Design a protein that fits this description.
The structure is cut from a larger assembly and holds 2 copies of chain A, 1 copy of chain B (about 210 residues) and 1 copy of chain C (about 220 residues).
Chain A: E1 3-5, H1 11-16, E2 31-34, E3 45-46, H2 50-60, E4 65-67, E5 75-76, E6 81-86, E7 89-91, E8 96-98, E9 100-101, E10 109-114, E11 121-129, H3 133-140, E12 147-150, E13 155-158, E14 174-182, E15 187-192, E16 196-199, E17 201-204, E18 211-214
Parallel strand pairs in A: 1-2, 2-18, 3-14
Antiparallel strand pairs in A: 4-17, 5-9, 6-7, 8-16, 10-15, 11-14, 11-16, 11-17, 12-13, 12-15
Chain B: E1 4-6, E2 10-13, E3 19-25, E4 33-37, E5 44-48, E6 52-53, E7 61-65, E8 69-74, E9 84-89, E10 95-96, E11 100-104, E12 112-115, H1 120-124, E13 128-137, E14 142-145, E15 157-161, E16 171-179, E17 190-196, E18 203-207
Chain C: E1 3-6, E2 10-12, E3 18-25, E4 34-40, E5 44-52, E6 57-60, E7 68-73, E8 78-83, E9 92-98, E10 107-108, E11 112-116, E12 125-129, E13 140-150, E14 167-170, E15 174-176, E16 179-189, E17 199-204, E18 209-214
Parallel strand pairs in C: 2-11
Antiparallel strand pairs in C: 1-3, 3-8, 4-5, 4-9, 5-6, 7-8, 9-10, 9-11, 12-13, 13-16, 14-16, 15-16, 17-18
Classes of the chains: A mainly beta (about 220), B mainly beta (about 210), C mainly beta (about 220).
The structure holds a molecule of 3 linked components (NAG-NAG-MAN) (2 copies) and 2-acetamido-2-deoxy-beta-D-glucopyranose (NAG).
PDB class: viral protein/immune system
Keywords: complex (hemagglutinin-immmunoglobulin), hemagglutinin, immunoglobulin, viral protein, immune system complex, Viral protein-Immune system COMPLEX
Entry title: influenza virus hemagglutinin complexed with a neutralizing antibody
């Protein structure tokens, strides 16, 4: 079996592209092995229904990413934080795009990307919950953001929630991760007027004999 | 057992200068690992599996090889790259190279001299150490005429120097003259003279009593 | 979160043995081999050996076999190395490290300075290095401290408890008749000094010494 | 915006809730702001609940409600409650045990 050892990373972090995990970009496996003390050292976050994202990725058996050309008109792409130091300076999840205002304007973002391929695509995105109201407006201008992601038949709208949280890596704000699978012939459309942590492409999905195992056994 | 003769032993390069260091195995290996080491710090993995960069290692670094000879090349030296690089064979009882000191070169600078006298404190114990600090100069080639010019017959002088810094890239040094309290107290003035490339005229700081 | 904390520096007479420890935290201790490498002044890096905690499959470099002894305690998450029958040739910095199978994930400990000698440990005497008067070149004043006669290494100086962490030059110590002497300089604007504070914090752990000399005129 | 650390050797269970006012007046009369929010989190999870104003079937004379929630806080963790209205604050924690217990729906005489 192709045993790929996660070492200090958990599949999810390898997925999102936490810097210490970037070493797994594009990895495949028959059994991904997760260690008991693996840790996350990038922007604090959470995955509503984490067990399912882990399971489906664990079964897809591949982290093959494909960068697509999203066009984020009028917002400042690629936003790092020191909690996710990418080398000596600030960084962020290699697979997400932190969109923030440009100048003094965060325009309504409404983009789309069609699945013209013969395969299913998996889009990982997220929403940012600012610690305080200032941060909210300082970052996205409007006082209440919203992330609406949909395909032709499903939809998901997430409103961010402002508030303090336990300090983690110095931050008391968070990112909430979400996913959207887009079937061939379908089309993805992201619309948001603030707080979006934009995707960069799609991971390819496979159905095989793969899975993940929590183990501290020496390979 | 799989001896790595990594050998440009020392390297002096200028910013932007391409650099390439080689390492050879005394048999055959599959991958070469390169650890970078700056002073007073544990080695950091820089390039593993011959050509892959560790997290954070700038792009100007790369590695290659495939048999006996391997290398670590740097597109364009930066001040921050002055370190000591080691190669690491892992194909049995692991072994490391002897390293390659990668020293940058920078515009010459004169030594900032300052001399100090045996503090009353030290003196109370019966000892007198007159220290002289020659700081932030370049090149590392410096000359300290201690023993008071004319009387200048070097003997009770210990010398020391820092290694090249990585931001300032200059070098620094500390010379110490140690006498027997009263013998110190039985002499004229104390003078520390220094001669460096920047000038023909040696820098002189001094104190005149005791 | 990965961190290999190593025991403090040593000083063992020629012939006995020193026992270095290395506490691992941030990863499952029993999953990866902990390897031992040393640094002898002007010699490079020397692979000593390794142990797989919980299985104790230990692999020695022939040169240290039955000389070197690797053990590792799971509950405490600590691996240990014991080197017996010492010579001055075993004086060096010993690092422990978890390089895993993928060196993107390699982690070396801070290091443990092992000093092999008959010499007794002596506290240091820290003297204040202040200027007399003639300071024409008064852009920024350079002061210093002299730590004389201590054994063994190391000693650690500091200026204004970590504040003055800029124009400081700590020079490598010199070994006189089996006793060390070192000195460190500090450069501050000529303004914040003549009648200010500026103190050098010397510490010699080997003998439980802590001296803070305020540099006064 | 308060916090309470689990310095104990055991898991804690915090039961809290949010109040949904029947009408807009009640909302402002009670919590002032026009839209409350309850954000409860530990170091890794989080829960934000926004109240929903509206009438409901009269129950015990009231047509407003309370919605109950819980948050388990593992040892070494810390709880932080932040809200600008509509919180039905906890008072402590219930201790949690793992044993042979359970519950049974029955009308049998013991
Ligand atoms: C809401 O309440 C929470 C909890 O009281 C506040 O969180 C606290 O934020 C402070 C920021 O000063 C954190 O301080 C930092 O502590 C760490 C560890 O001690 C240290 O590295 C830093 O030096 C700094 O002092 C504090 O730890 C953190 N506590 C918790 C549980 O998160 C939050 O600020 C409050 N907001 C308001 C407006 O009251
Ligand atoms: C929205 O519509 C609902 C339903 O029509 C209203 O609920 C009703 O509220 C009245 C308040 O007068 C309740 O009356 C009480 O009835 C009980 C039982 O008959 C009795 O004990 C009291 O004497 C009183 O009359 C009524 O029962 C209740 N009906 C239901 C289904 O809840 C609600 O007030 C409406 N709000 C508005 C603005 O229209
Ligand atoms: C991952 O694989 C895809 C598809 O073959 C490729 O285009 C992409 O750039 C690869 N990523 C890396 C890090 O090589």
């Amino acid at each position: 079996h192709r045993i790929l050892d996660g070492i200090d990373c958990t599949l999810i972090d390898a997925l999102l592209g936490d810097p210490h995990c970037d070493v797994f970009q594009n990895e495949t496996w028959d059994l991904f092995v997760e260690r008991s003390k693996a840790f996350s050292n990038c922007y604090p976050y959470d995955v509503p229904d984490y067990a399912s994202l882990r399971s489906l990725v664990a079964s897809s058996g591949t982290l093959e990413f494909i960068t697509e050309g999203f066009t984020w008109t009028g917002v400042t792409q690629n936003g790092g934080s020191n909690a996710c130091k990418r080398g000596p300076g600030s960084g962020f999840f290699s697979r997400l795009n932190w969109l923030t205002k440009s100048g003094s304007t965060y325009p309504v973002l409404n983009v789309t990307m069609p699945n013209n391929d013969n395969f299913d695509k998996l889009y990982i995105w997220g929403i940012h919950h600012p610690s305080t109201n200032q941060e909210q407006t300082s970052l996205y201008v409007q006082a209440s953001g919203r992330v609406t992601v949909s395909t032709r038949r499903s939809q998901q709208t997430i409103i961010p929630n402002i508030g303090s949280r336990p300090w983690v890596r110095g931050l008391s704000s968070r990112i909430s991760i979400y996913w959207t699978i887009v079937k061939p012939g379908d089309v993805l459309v992201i619309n948001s007027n603030g707080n979006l942590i934009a995707p960069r492409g799609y991971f390819k999905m496979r159905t095989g004999k793969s899975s993940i195992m929590r183990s501290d056994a020496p390979i | 057992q799989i001896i790595l003769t990594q050998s440009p032993a020392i390297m002096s390069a200028s910013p932007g200068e391409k650099v390439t260091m080689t390492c050879s195995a005394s048999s055959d290996i599959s991958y070469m690992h390169w650890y970078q080491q700056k002073s007073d710090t544990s080695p950091k993995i820089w390039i593993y599996d011959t050509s892959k960069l560790a997290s954070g290692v700038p792009a100007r670094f790369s590695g290659s090889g495939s048999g006996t000879s391997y290398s670590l090349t740097i597109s364009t030296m930066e001040a921050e790259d002055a370190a000591t690089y080691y190669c690491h064979q892992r194909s049995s009882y692991p072994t490391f190279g002897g390293g390659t000191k990668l020293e940058i070169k920078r515009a010459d600078a004169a030594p900032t001299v300052s001399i100090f006298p045996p503090s009353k404190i030290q003196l109370t114990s019966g000892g007198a150490s007159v220290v002289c600090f020659l700081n932030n100069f370049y090149p590392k080639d410096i000359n300290v005429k201690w023993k008071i010019d004319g009387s200048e017959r070097q003997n009770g002088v210990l010398n020391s120097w820092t290694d090249q810094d990585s931001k300032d890239s200059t070098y620094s040094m500390s010379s110490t003259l140690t006498l027997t309290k009263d013998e110190y107290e039985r002499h004229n003035s104390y003078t520390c003279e220094a001669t460096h490339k920047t000038s023909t005229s040696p820098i002189v700081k001094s104190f005149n009593r005791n | 979160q990965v961190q290999l904390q190593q025991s403090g520096a040593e000083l063992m007479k020629p012939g006995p043995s020193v026992k270095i420890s290395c506490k691992a935290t941030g990863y499952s201790f029993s999953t990866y081999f902990i390897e031992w490498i040393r640094q002898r002044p002007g010699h490079g890096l020397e692979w000593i050996g390794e142990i797989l905690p919980g299985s104790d499959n230990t692999n020695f470099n022939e040169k240290f076999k039955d000389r070197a002894t690797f053990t590792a305690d799971t509950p405490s998450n600590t691996a240990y190395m014991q080197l017996s029958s010492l010579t001055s040739e075993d004086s060096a910095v010993y690092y422990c490290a978890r390089p895993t199978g993928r060196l993107w994930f390699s982690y070396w400990g801070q290091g443990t300075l092992v000093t092999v000698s008959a010499a007794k440990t002596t506290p240091p005497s820290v003297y204040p290095l202040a200027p007399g008067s003639a300071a024409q070149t008064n852009s920024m004043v350079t002061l210093g401290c002299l730590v004389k006669g201590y054994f063994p290494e190391p000693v650690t100086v500091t200026w204004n408890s970590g504040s003055l962490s800029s124009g400081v030059h700590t020079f490598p110590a010199v070994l006189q008749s089996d006793l060390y002497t070192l000195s460190s300089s500090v450069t501050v604007p000529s303004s914040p000094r003549p009648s200010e504070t500026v103190t050098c914090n010397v510490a010699h752990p080997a003998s439980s010494t802590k001296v803070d000399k305020k540099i006064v005129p």
